Amino acid sequence: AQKTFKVTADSGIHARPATVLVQTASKYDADVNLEYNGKTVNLKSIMGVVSLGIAKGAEITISASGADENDALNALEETMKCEGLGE
């Protein structure tokens, strides 16, 4: 499944926020991906997510595919909202 968000954090997704998203994604069996502007990366890789240079105002899609895909997605959505990263 997938869900789209808008990035609202001023400094966008640098290493710190990227680490938060990966630590959550890392807890699930599903494959978890982050798409931005037509580029797709593993959400279980910090370097992968930082390489995008995602900034404030960006639209991103997160998908999960597997046995815990729907709880994986919920987790990430909450992670994202609690941290002020995106909504």
Curated annotation (Swiss-Prot):
Modified residues (Tele-phosphohistidine): H14
GO biological processes: phosphoenolpyruvate-dependent sugar phosphotransferase system; regulation of carbohydrate utilization
Phosphoserine modified-residue sites: S11, S45
A Pfam family matched in the record: PTS-HPr
Residue span, HPr domain: 1-87
Keywords for the protein's UniProt record, in alphabetical order: Cytoplasm, Phosphoprotein, Phosphotransferase system, Sugar transport, Transcription, Transcription regulation, Transport
Disulfide bond entries: none
InterPro entries membership: HPr, HPr-like, HPr-like_sf, PTS_HPr_His_P_site, PTS_HPr_Ser_P_site
Activity control note: Phosphorylation on Ser-45 inhibits the phosphoryl transfer from enzyme I to HPr.
Gene3D superfamilies, alphabetized: HPr-like
Highest taxon of the lineage: Bacteria
Catalytic residues in the record: H14
A GO cellular-component term linked to this record: cytoplasm
Subcellular location, record wording: Cytoplasm
Mod. after translation: Phosphorylated during sporulation.
Stated family: Belongs to the HPr family.
Reported function: General (non sugar-specific) component of the phosphoenolpyruvate-dependent sugar phosphotransferase system (sugar PTS). This major carbohydrate active-transport system catalyzes the phosphorylation of incoming sugar substrates concomitantly with their translocation across the cell membrane. The phosphoryl group from phosphoenolpyruvate (PEP) is transferred to the phosphoryl carrier protein HPr by enzyme I. Phospho-HPr then transfers it to the PTS EIIA domain. P-Ser-HPr interacts with the catabolite control protein A (CcpA), forming a complex that binds to DNA at the catabolite response elements cre, operator sites preceding a large number of catabolite-regulated genes. Thus, P-Ser-HPr is a corepressor in carbon catabolite repression (CCR), a mechanism that allows bacteria to coordinate and optimize the utilization of available carbon sources. P-Ser-HPr also plays a role in inducer exclusion, in which it probably interacts with several non-PTS permeases and inhibits their transport activity.
Protein name, per record: Phosphocarrier protein HPr
Organism name: Bacillus subtilis (strain 168)
